[PDB]
Design a protein around this ligand. Structure first.
Ligand SMILES: [Mg+2]
Ligand SMILES: [Mg+2]
Ligand SMILES: [Mg+2]
Ligand SMILES: [Mg+2]
Ligand SMILES: [Mg+2]
Ligand SMILES: [Mg+2]
Ligand SMILES: [Mg+2]
Ligand SMILES: [Mg+2]
Ligand SMILES: [Mg+2]
Ligand SMILES: [Mg+2]
Ligand SMILES: [Mg+2]
Ligand SMILES: [Mg+2]
Ligand SMILES: [Mg+2]
Ligand SMILES: [Mg+2]
Ligand SMILES: [Mg+2]
Ligand SMILES: [Mg+2]
Ligand SMILES: [Mg+2]
Ligand SMILES: [Mg+2]
Ligand SMILES: [Mg+2]
Ligand SMILES: [Mg+2]
Ligand SMILES: [Mg+2]
Ligand SMILES: [Mg+2]
Ligand SMILES: [Mg+2]
Ligand SMILES: [Mg+2]
Ligand SMILES: [Mg+2]
Ligand SMILES: [Mg+2]
Ligand SMILES: [Mg+2]
Ligand SMILES: [Mg+2]
Ligand SMILES: [Mg+2]
Ligand SMILES: [Mg+2]
Ligand SMILES: [Mg+2]
Ligand SMILES: [Mg+2]
Ligand SMILES: [Mg+2]
Ligand SMILES: [Mg+2]
Ligand SMILES: [Mg+2]
Ligand SMILES: [Mg+2]
Ligand SMILES: [Mg+2]
Ligand SMILES: [Mg+2]
Ligand SMILES: [Mg+2]
Ligand SMILES: [Mg+2]
Ligand SMILES: [Mg+2]
Ligand SMILES: [Mg+2]
Ligand SMILES: [Mg+2]
Ligand SMILES: [Mg+2]
Ligand SMILES: [Mg+2]
Ligand SMILES: [Mg+2]
Ligand SMILES: [Mg+2]
Ligand SMILES: [Mg+2]
Ligand SMILES: [Zn+2]
Lengths: 181, 23, 69, 116, 83
RNA sequence: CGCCUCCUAAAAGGUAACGGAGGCGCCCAAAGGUCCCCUCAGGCGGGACGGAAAUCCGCCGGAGAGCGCAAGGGUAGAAGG
RNA sequence: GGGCGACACACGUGCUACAAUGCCCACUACAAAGCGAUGCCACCCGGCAACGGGGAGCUAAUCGCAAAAAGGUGGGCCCAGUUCGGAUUGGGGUCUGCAACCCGACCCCAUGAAGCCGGAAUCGCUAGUAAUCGCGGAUCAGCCAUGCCGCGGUGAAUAC
RNA sequence: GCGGGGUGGAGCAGCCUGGUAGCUCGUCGGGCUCAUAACCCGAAGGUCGUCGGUUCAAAUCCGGCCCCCGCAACCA
């Protein structure tokens, strides 16, 4: 399988330093990444122009993986929502494609972000997972100003094998996540 | 323009000078 | 993976404006960025860009000590 | 976005485009194009990726712009409002600040007329 | 503003009261008619009663509010709105 | 005024009153046959626009969800998707 | 010392505009009436600039205010809420004055709002007029003058 | 006891057929007038009597209570 920088860096620098700080007695005890799930709760495409192949074409370029649909679980009056209506996209990244995405995310995306002052320290699950939001998909390198019709950001969920926020915090900072406080 | 101080026509209006109307 | 629904991954060349080049994989073989991890203000320690201000106000006026005592 | 954090209008002369940035006016435009030796007349679409990064690097490094500019000015009023200055109460009651009559006009600070 | 080449204005008589108290250690009350004055670094922590035309308004000065005039802290008008 | 559900009904079945409460006079070409796979409501925590509530991640949750429509019975070891 | 400068609102008189018969920069023309000895201040220098330090002339057809401006030549903008428009505010300075918080003008950096030609209604002007352009004076330390009293430049349409 | 009804300030629509509150007058701000009326131009205000339920959503469909109009209350 693929040799990439972050995947390599995890085993080489992140792994040992982690075993240092928390002193695990088993290799599998030490924090790992399981999956990063990307989401676009969209729903602007509820009725209107429920043609969002433009964003599925977007997310497919960002992650090299075809997103799946999300549809309404229940109908909602105030939101103008028929049950089963197509209102969002979700792609689940594991293994190599997970690293490659995070790799470009940490090295490129967060920098290009408007007035970036560091990731939110407090967006930590409690069970050692992490979630963050994006206002724009232009934040990535593979999406030029030209090929976009409208601003559409996303939800980003990263799951760890950790049990506490503290091991999770360390695993992620050691990988290269920039926290403000 | 005549209300816009940062122009030639503008400072003639006020009857003052500066970088945007030199003497 | 399924075939015919997936954009294809290839070795990629992300270039920054500091002249950082990043070795990775992508759907596009060559990309240029405006900024990166290697040069960003918040990123590089605490390179406080245009303002190492310390305010400066408000004790800072000090013009001067010439009022009398 | 190109410079700085915003993507200045391509198809305009490089000097005008720059003013489409919060924090850079006509003066600061010719001023950035002096200290970089870039032709004030050329269309933005016709910058070298070299000319780009040079023009880029000066502007971003000399002046506070877009986000942080707004941020300080914000904090500047924030404090003025919070010390209880006269200029503070005027911001906190939303009225004008610079010795204008309020009995008429004053609309730009006040907003559309709340008739009675 | 007050022309930078000249001075930073404080009414002579009030400056002295601050400085007298500085020696002794501050602070009593300071009934004043000195709106034309500048708040000045020696004044921090004192409690000054400024005349707004009507009352003597108690203003605790801080390290943040220095370069201003005194009267900016004694409002001349009472306004609660209309209707 | 016919039909269905519950109670009255006295632990088989049945049981009256101008006793107490509600529903039906339809519907579905899939909401049917079968093979294969899947598990809910809700609570806490986390997440751009995003709200009490859209979609996303985690942990707890035997059924309090769902089963077109009244009610009862049944039911996730499916009759639910 | 404060108020006459307030501000949920309504009206009168105005200023500047919404732009290409226009906006902007450079160079370049042609007025008049006035005004001026702790007054106007040529010119030189420091300053992006307001201004500041020098310093000559003039009781003024002599010297100064002084450039008139629309205009002319050239160049840029290219129909866009814009190189239109310049309100609102942030930051920094000059000056007058004992003193510019309430509550002055001006200069500079940044901010760049409303406004795409105006509902019912309604005003002025018959020719060197209307429209448009600049200049001065009184009051006056400075100035909230876009007001007022004058002065010239360009210069119509129409009255059956 | 049977049928109908409650919606800006007044008086009526919309309810049957669930998603969208309308008409005349009146009120308020402007205009014409010396002034008022009329007339002309703009503009506010009903969360639909309540509490409950059905629904994805109720002025609208279903129940409760409240108040109003009409009719009935006969052989005795
Ligand atoms: Mg946390
Ligand atoms: Mg991008
Ligand atoms: Mg975990
Ligand atoms: Mg302009
Ligand atoms: Mg004009
Ligand atoms: Mg700008
Ligand atoms: Mg005022
Ligand atoms: Mg029958
Ligand atoms: Mg029985
Ligand atoms: Mg029984
Ligand atoms: Mg029985
Ligand atoms: Mg039997
Ligand atoms: Mg089927
Ligand atoms: Mg079935
Ligand atoms: Mg089937
Ligand atoms: Mg749940
Ligand atoms: Mg939640
Ligand atoms: Mg939110
Ligand atoms: Mg939510
Ligand atoms: Mg059930
Ligand atoms: Mg008066
Ligand atoms: Mg008006
Ligand atoms: Mg006026
Ligand atoms: Mg007017
Ligand atoms: Mg605009
Ligand atoms: Mg003042
Ligand atoms: Mg402009
Ligand atoms: Mg507009
Ligand atoms: Mg236009
Ligand atoms: Mg016009
Ligand atoms: Mg007109
Ligand atoms: Mg008419
Ligand atoms: Mg006549
Ligand atoms: Mg005079
Ligand atoms: Mg004067
Ligand atoms: Mg004023
Ligand atoms: Mg004048
Ligand atoms: Mg009514
Ligand atoms: Mg009907
Ligand atoms: Mg209907
Ligand atoms: Mg009226
Ligand atoms: Mg009338
Ligand atoms: Mg429901
Ligand atoms: Mg409704
Ligand atoms: Mg209801
Ligand atoms: Mg309801
Ligand atoms: Mg009812
Ligand atoms: Mg009767
Ligand atoms: Zn870089």
């Amino acid at each position: 399988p693929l040799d990439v920088a972050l995947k390599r860096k995890y085993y080489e620098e992140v792994r040992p330093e982690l075993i240092r700080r928390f002193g695990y007695q088993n290799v599998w005890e030490v924090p790992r990444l399981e999956k990063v799930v990307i989401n676009q709760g969209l729903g602007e495409a509820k009725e209107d122009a429920r043609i969002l192949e433009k964003a599925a074409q977007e997310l497919a370029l960002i992650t090299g993986q075809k997103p799946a649909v999300t549809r309404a679980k229940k109908s909602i009056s105030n939101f103008k929502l028929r049950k089963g209506m197509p209102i969002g996209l979700r792609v689940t990244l594991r293994r190599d494609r997970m690293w490659i995405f995070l790799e470009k995310l940490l090295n490129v995306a967060l920098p290009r972000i408007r007035d970036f002052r560091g990731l939110n320290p407090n967006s930590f699950d409690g069970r050692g997972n992490y979630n963050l939001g994006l206002r724009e998909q232009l934040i990535f390198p593979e999406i030029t100003y030209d090929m976009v019709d409208a601003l559409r950001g996303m939800d980003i969920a990263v799951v760890t094998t950790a049990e506490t926020d503290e091991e999770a915090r360390a695993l992620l900072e050691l990988l290269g996540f920039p926290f403000r406080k | 323009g005549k209300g816009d101080r940062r122009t030639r026509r503008g400072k003639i209006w006020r009857g003052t000078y500066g970088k945007y109307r030199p003497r | 993976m399924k075939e015919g629904i997936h954009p294809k991954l290839v070795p990629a060349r992300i270039i920054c404006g500091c002249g950082n080049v990043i070795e990775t994989y992508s759907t596009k073989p060559e990309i240029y960025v405006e900024v990166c991890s290697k040069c960003h203000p918040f990123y590089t320690g605490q390179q406080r860009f245009v303002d190492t201000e310390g305010r400066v106000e408000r004790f800072q006026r000090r013009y001067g000590d010439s009022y009398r005592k | 976005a190109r410079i700085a954090g915003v993507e200045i209008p391509r198809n305009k002369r490089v000097d005008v485009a720059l003013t489409y940035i919060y924090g850079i006016g006509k003066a600061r435009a010719k001023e950035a194009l002096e200290k970089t030796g870039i032709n004030p007349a050329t269309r933005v679409k016709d910058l070298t990726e070299a000319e780009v990064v040079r023009l880029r690097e000066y502007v971003e490094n000399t002046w506070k712009l877009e986000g942080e500019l707004r941020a300080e000015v914000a904090a500047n009023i924030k404090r003025l409002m919070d010390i209880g200055c006269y200029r503070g109460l005027r911001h906190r009651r939303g009225l004008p600040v610079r010795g204008q009559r309020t009995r008429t006009n004053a609309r730009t600070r006040k907003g559309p007329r709340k008739t009675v | 503003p007050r022309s930078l080449k000249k001075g930073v204005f404080v009414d002579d008589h009030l400056l002295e009261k601050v400085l007298e108290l500085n020696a002794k250690g501050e602070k009593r009350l300071i009934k004043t008619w000195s709106r034309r004055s500048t708040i000045v670094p020696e004044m921090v922590g004192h409690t000054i009663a400024v005349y707004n035309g009507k009352q003597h308004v108690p203003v605790y000065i801080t390290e943040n509010m220095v370069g201003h005039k005194l009267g900016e802290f004694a409002p001349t008008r009472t306004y609660r709105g209309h209707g």
